[PDB]
Design a protein around this ligand. Sequence first.
Ligand code: NA
Ligand code: NA
Ligand code: NA
Ligand code: NA
Ligand code: NA
Ligand code: NA
Ligand code: NA
Ligand code: NA
Lengths: 66, 66
Amino acid sequence: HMRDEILDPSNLVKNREILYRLMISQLMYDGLEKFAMELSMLVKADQCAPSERLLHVMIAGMQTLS
Amino acid sequence: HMRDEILDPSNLVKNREILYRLMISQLMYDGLEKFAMELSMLVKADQCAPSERLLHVMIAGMQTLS
Ligand code: NA
Ligand code: NA
Ligand code: NA
Ligand code: NA
Ligand code: NA
Ligand code: NA
Ligand code: NA
Ligand code: NA
């Protein structure tokens, strides 16, 4: 489950896989199904559920980096 | 410039606009130009430059939220 995912900041390959799943989940949540499915097929992503987790992660991340 | 953007966590509409620009920039950086341009046209996004800022924001955000 995406909710239980614990990051290793040094595994850039795994982190890019996680980012694309978060992007597919965000697109699904916002109703852009065809776009989300086309992206999933191109990057061979694992199954994603609709979620706006990426929006909340972005808000926390930008604050931490500022 | 995306590099100078300062967040208001309470402006969810502006934050979703920022997220989609970060997503378009990430897709461009990773070489997925057609996908990035189709997304930009659907959401009427402001001009984006290729950048992997979203990946670094995600890594910081997930750590802060954990
Ligand atoms: Na990781
Ligand atoms: Na690892
Ligand atoms: Na949203
Ligand atoms: Na998400
Ligand atoms: Na803002
Ligand atoms: Na504001
Ligand atoms: Na990247
Ligand atoms: Na980006």
